Structure formats: structure tokens, C-alpha cells
């Protein structure tokens, strides 16, 4: 099994509703930590991490994010000047993380930055050079390519620190991080007009669900796509057009790595 530890940072312009800075941490598909510019502390979103991490962990994680908080705000002003934008609603985003592989394989890592939800700058870990598809990133790229300690440090995090803690998290959140199978329903709905296959309560989000008419695969099928529930699990509805009197047998087939064997359900 592949596993990941990823962080998502969002800086928003001082404005309505949303805190000026919000960061979230994920092990695989499960959110486990949160920080925002109102509370100004890194807090658990999972019990396993709350139980297994002492005062020093939360103290340090809070301090780290406190450094990130002003940084991104400064960024929004810097990039507005660079793009000659002067006001309005603006965003900075940062994505970084690592992936651990047992099947194979070479470990991966990434750090990606975005300005107003468009590619700003990111690191090529293999070449150890920063890439930018825009002119307003070039001046940052030239500074960041020079900065050895920054570059090697970031690389050390993605390849070393990130992987190491991910491994600790996988041990400490072991049962909590296990896949949970979908509970699936296959029933006539909307006054017997449509036949709907609904899978709910599954984790992680990734899922295959296909409909079959009398051993044949059904195209022209309607799907909500995977969407979150309230408890860290996910759901999906796939439905097709129907007749209640018809002779042909209908089946719904589900693939989820919480199943470990293909699951079929008949009408």
C-alpha cells in the first residue's frame, strides 16, 4: 500500500467569512491537524494524534505555522505589486508533502505554490531547481535557486523528515487509518424511473462503481461523483435509466481497497 503525508496552506486577503490563514494536514485521505489565523494554534482533528503527541509536538507545530502565517500575507502584497494589481480579493496557496511506497518503489515529494489559484512556483526535486510558468515568479526563482540551505533543507524535509513522521503516524493511527468498506444499496428510485447504486461510509475516497445489464457494461450512466460525508467517510451515487417490468437482470459492481474482493449487488 501507498501512503502520504500532505499539507495545504491557504492565505486569503483580509475580507469576509474566511480566516486570513488556514492550514490543514492529511495522512492519506484523513485530516488530522488544523491551524488558522484566529486561534493561532495547531490543533488535532483526530483522536489518535491527540493521544499520541505530547506538549512538545503541539508547541513546535504551532510555532512553525506561526512563521507561515505572516509570510503568506506578505506574499499577497508582494505579488499584487508584481502583477500591478492594486486591490480586491486575492489568495496564496502552498501544497507540500511526501508519499511512501512499499510496492516498488521510489519515494516521492512535492512543494507547489500558487497565486490566485494559478501555478506560481514549484520545486523540481531531481534537478534541485525551482520552476515557474509565469514572469512574476522569475525574480523569486532566481533568488531561490541560489539559496542552497533553503533548497537542501526543503529536500531534507520532503525526503527525510516527512517520510519519517508519516511512518510514525501510520503506527500511531494504525486502526484509525485502515480502509473502511462501503455499505452499498441498489434499488429502484424516483418512482421506478431510475435504478440507483449508492455506496456510502467508505474510506479512502478512491472508488470504482459500475453498472451492468445482463452481463453487459452500461455506458450513458449518471454519477454524482465521490463526495464527503460528515465523519471522514465518502459516498457516491451512480444511476441509470430504468424499466420495472423488463426481463434483464441488473447488477452493481464495486471496487474499493476496503473490500479486497470485488463486490456485486443485484436488484
Amino acid at each position: 500500500g501507498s501512503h502520504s503525508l500532505r499539507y495545504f496552506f491557504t492565505w486569503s486577503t483580509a475580507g469576509s467569512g474566511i480566516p486570513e490563514f488556514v492550514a490543514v494536514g492529511y495522512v492519506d485521505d484523513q485530516q488530522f491537524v488544523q491551524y488558522d489565523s484566529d486561534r493561532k494554534e495547531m490543533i488535532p482533528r483526530q483522536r489518535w494524534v491527540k493521544e499520541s503527541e505530547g506538549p512538545e509536538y503541539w508547541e513546535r507545530e504551532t510555532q512553525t505555522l506561526r512563521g507561515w502565517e505572516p509570510w503568506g500575507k506578505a506574499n499577497i502584497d508582494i505579488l499584487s505589486k508584481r502583477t500591478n494589481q492594486t486591490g480586491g480579493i486575492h489568495t496564496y496557496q502552498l501544497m507540500c508533502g511526501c508519499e511512501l511506497r512499499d510496492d516498488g518503489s521510489s519515494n516521492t515529494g512535492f512543494v507547489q505554490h500558487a497565486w490566485d489559484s494559478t501555478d506560481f512556483i514549484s520545486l523540481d526535486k531531481d534537478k534541485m531547481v525551482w520552476v515557474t510558468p509565469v514572469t512574476w515568479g522569475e525574480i523569486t526563482k532566481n533568488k531561490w535557486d541560489r539559496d542552497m540551505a533553503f533548497n537542501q533543507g526543503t529536500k531534507g524535509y520532503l525526503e527525510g523528515i516527512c517520510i519519517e513522521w508519516l511512518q510514525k503516524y501510520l503506527k500511531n493511527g494504525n486502526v484509525e487509518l485502515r480502509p473502511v468498506k462501503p455499505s452499498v444499496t441498489f434499488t429502484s428510485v424516483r418512482g421506478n424511473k431510475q435504478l440507483s447504486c449508492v455506496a456510502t461510509g467508505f474510506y479512502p475516497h478512491s472508488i470504482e462503481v459500475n453498472l451492468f445489464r445482463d452481463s453487459a457494461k452500461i455506458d450513458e450512466t449518471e454519477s454524482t461523483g465521490v463526495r464527503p460525508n460528515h465523519d471522514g467517510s465518502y459516498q457516491i451515487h451512480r444511476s441509470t435509466e430504468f424499466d420495472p417490468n423488463s426481463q434483464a437482470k441488473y447488477s452493481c459492481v464495486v471496487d474499493h481497497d476496503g473490500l479486497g474482493q470485488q463486490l456485486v449487488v443485484f436488484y
Binding site: 503525508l5 499539507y7 492550514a23 494536514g25 491537524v33 495547531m42 507545530e61 512553525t64 505555522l65 512563521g67 507561515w68 509570510w71 506578505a74 506574499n75 508582494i78 505579488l79 507540500c96 512543494v111 523569486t140 533568488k143 531561490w144 539559496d147 533553503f150 533543507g153 526543503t154 524535509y157 520532503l158 523528515i161 516527512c162 513522521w165
Partner: peptide
Amino acid sequence: FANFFIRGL
């Protein structure tokens, strides 16, 4: 464990 390597733009 959050990344802590921060450098100005």
C-alpha cells in the same frame, strides 16, 4: 510534521 523551511519571495 509541517514543513518549516520558509524563505521570502
